[PDB]
Amino acid sequence: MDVLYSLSKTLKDARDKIVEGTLYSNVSDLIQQFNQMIITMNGNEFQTGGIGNLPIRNWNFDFGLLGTTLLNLDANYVETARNTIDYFVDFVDNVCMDEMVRESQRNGIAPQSDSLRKLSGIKFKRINFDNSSEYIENWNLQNRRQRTGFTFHKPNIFPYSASFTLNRSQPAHDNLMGTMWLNAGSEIQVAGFDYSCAINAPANIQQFEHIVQLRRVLTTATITLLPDAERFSFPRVINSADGATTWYFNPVILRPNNVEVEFLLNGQIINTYQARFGTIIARNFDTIRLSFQLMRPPNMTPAVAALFPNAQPFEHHATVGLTLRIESAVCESVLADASKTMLANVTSVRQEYAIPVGPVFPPGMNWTDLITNYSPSREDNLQRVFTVASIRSMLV
């Protein structure tokens, strides 16, 4: 991995720094590293495999070194370097794709493709130089059992889930009490509905709880909390739990009462926010507990009092909401996020070569299935393929 990354980084530096007219002293160390890579790779035969529709490709390395002959680089030097760099970049991209399309149940973090297994030999270790990118840095630290994290903007931590719970229900679905929620990506939009508007509640208070267990621990998370859930504030015709029939939802939005967001780690109260909205910070957590109350307004204007009668039928259903958005976080494990392209890159490579479903990942690299059952083996394989994808992104 470090050798493959070092090849990619050397090639990127060569493409960016070996430019016409540049001082010889701008590239001396780069030329030395590039010649070291050429020497190490010369005389070695590589094969990128024929898994799926990925074509089998054979790579031979017999390239002359780069000289150091002009004070300012000229077009001839750049052209020779470009020829060598193009061949090497093609080889590295093919190696990255081959590694990306494989997986293993037992040693998911270890190399899978023959080319990357060969590049893990001692003879190629000389190619290894600066490992500065976030993913390679995390890879190297993780190999040493050191604490490190990936920073995600809008981490895709919640598997898609749009469902409801009815705590009070009837066959006619006309006096319902329960909760709706959408947990999608970095967003949790929850709502608690009472059709009776807590007319018969002990203190005209109906308590609602939503507990979301994160599949991985998130640290240093910045979170936006908003009182209302816009997704559950318009009339809906909703299938029953079995799908036998459909019931009617006609929300009227009330201010959430006694709102408490608890971010829990190991069952301990790490962070607590009571009636606080806007931007909040969750230090380090793996569970979110949103508890909110629907309180019947003690004093109502005649129209509001007309909305909520003392008994059935109930045509306007009182709803309290909550929206939680993880704008950024840090996770010890790799995750899909809104800014990076690693999941997109791996999925595109797997789809474009018709890679058969393996024993580790879900079909089509479906992210909801992947995060739903985010096992340690899947974590290892995903980290491997994401690191390879980030290596490939430096050139392709």
Binding site: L23, Y24, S25, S28, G67, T68, T69, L71
Partner: protein, 49 residues
């Protein structure tokens, strides 16, 4: 003035390079290049630069 066992063609080039190296108005980059510029002898290819 080569720091890597450098050679030049021909002796007149050596005289010119020494004079430029010792000159005080020479650019530091030019001086460092004179000290670092190298020949390349590829005996397997039967080529010399």
């Amino acid at each position: 003035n080569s720091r890597d066992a450098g050679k030049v063609v021909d002796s007149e080039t050596a005289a010119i390079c020494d004079a430029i190296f010792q000159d005080e108005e020479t650019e530091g980059v030019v001086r460092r290049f004179i000290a670092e510029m190298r020949q390349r002898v590829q005996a397997d290819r039967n080529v010399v630069n």
